[PDB]
Write a protein that binds this ligand. Sequence first.
Ligand SMILES: Nc1ncnc2c1ncn2[C@@H]1O[C@H](COP(=O)(O)OP(=O)(O)O)[C@@H](O)[C@H]1O
Ligand SMILES: [Mg+2]
Length: 415
Amino acid sequence: PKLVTWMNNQRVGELTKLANGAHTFKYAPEWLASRYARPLSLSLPLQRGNITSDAVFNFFDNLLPDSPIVRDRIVKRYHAKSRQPFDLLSEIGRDSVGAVTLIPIMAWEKLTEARLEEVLTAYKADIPLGMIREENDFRISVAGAQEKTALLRIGNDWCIPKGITPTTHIIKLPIQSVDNEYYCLLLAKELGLNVPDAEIIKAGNVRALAVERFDRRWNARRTVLLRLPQEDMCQTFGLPSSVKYESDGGPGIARIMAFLMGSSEALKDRYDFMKFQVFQWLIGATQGHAKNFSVFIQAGGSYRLTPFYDIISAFPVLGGTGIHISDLKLAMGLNASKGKKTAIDKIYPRHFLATAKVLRFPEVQMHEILSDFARMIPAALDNVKTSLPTDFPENVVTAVESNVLRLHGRLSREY
Ligand SMILES: Nc1ncnc2c1ncn2[C@@H]1O[C@H](COP(=O)(O)OP(=O)(O)O)[C@@H](O)[C@H]1O
Ligand SMILES: [Mg+2]
C-alpha cells in the first residue's frame, strides 16, 4: 500500500500506488527542511506535496532489472501483487543502485564455498538476482539485462546482507562475457580512465565477475557501510528504460554534454565523457546507451559524473555468429559531414573533432585525447596482457588487441 523511502538513516519520503494505479511520491517535510537535502532524482526536484508525473513511475521502474523475464522470475519468487514496479519493489526494494531504500543497520550471514556456489547458480532454477529460496531476508535489485546478483564482502568473506544492510559488489554470471569485461576494465584503468575495480571469483565450477560498487562507501574506520545517491541518465531525464538507446528516443552525446554543463565538475566531466567515447570506439563497445552513464547526486542537489562501467567489447563476438565488424555501431553517434557517423569500422579522428566543435568542447582538448591514445595504446595493451591470469581465454585477448591496434592505427598515422 505504501513504501517509505530512506537514504541510509534518514527518511526521504514515501512512494504510494493510488486507486487509479498511478505512482505518486511525496517528500517528507523533515527531509525538505533537513541540512543538505537533495532530490531522489534530478527529474523529481524537492517540493512539497504529491508528485504525479510519469517521472515517478519511470524513476523507480529504472531501479528494476530490465528483462521482462527476470521480472517474471521475481513475481513468482515473492508472489508480487503484480508486475508493476511498486509491487516488485515492495519485495526487493531494500537494496538498489544508489542510496534508495524502500520498505513498507549492520547484519548478515557468511557464505560457505557451497552456499556461495548456490547463489551464483540460482538463476539455473529461474531464481531472480540469485535470491535463493533458502533465504527470505535477501532483497536486492540491480538494473541491466545481464544476469547478475549483489553481495556484501566483509574482509575476505562473501556474505548475504540482512535487512537494510547494503551490498558492496555487483556480480555478473555467465549468461564469454566474464573474461571480456574483466579485460576491458583493466584496459580502461591502464589508460587512466575512471572505472571500478573488478576481480574474477571462482566458486567450484563457476566464473563470475565481482565489480566493486562506487555507490557504496565505508567510513574511514571501516565500521559503517553507507550508500551514495546516484542515478543513470534515463532517470535523470525522466525517461523510461525502454528508450535508453538514442535510436529509440534516448539521449545522445549532445544532450549529455549539455547536461554536464551543470555538473559541479563540468569541465572535467565533459572532458572524461568525450575521452570515453573515443575509448568505446577503440574497443568496439556498442552498448554505451543512457543507463550506462550515471551521476552522483551530492549535498544540495549538485551532481557529478560517476566512474564508467558495463564495458564490453563486441570484437570477441565477431565471426562466430555471422556478426561482421561492419555491423558494429556506437550507441551514440558522432557528427558526420551529413547526419551522423555510427559505424565503428568507418569512424576516424575527424568525426570526434567535428562533434567537439558543434558542442563547444575545446578543440585543443580533443586533440590531446586523440594523441594520448595514439601513443599510449600499444604499451597499455602490453601491460594488461601481462597482468592476465594464465588461465584467461586467449581468443578474447587476440580479437581485442588485433582489432584495437587496427583502429589505433588511425590515430598513430595522425599523431
Ligand atoms: N561499479 C558499480 N558501482 C555502482 N553501480 C554500478 C556499478 N556497475 C554497475 N552499476 C549499476 O548497476 C547497473 C547494472 O550493471 P551493468 O554493468 O550495467 O549491467 P548489464 O551489464 O546488466 O547492463 C547499472 O545500470 C548501474 O546503475
Ligand atoms: Mg546498464
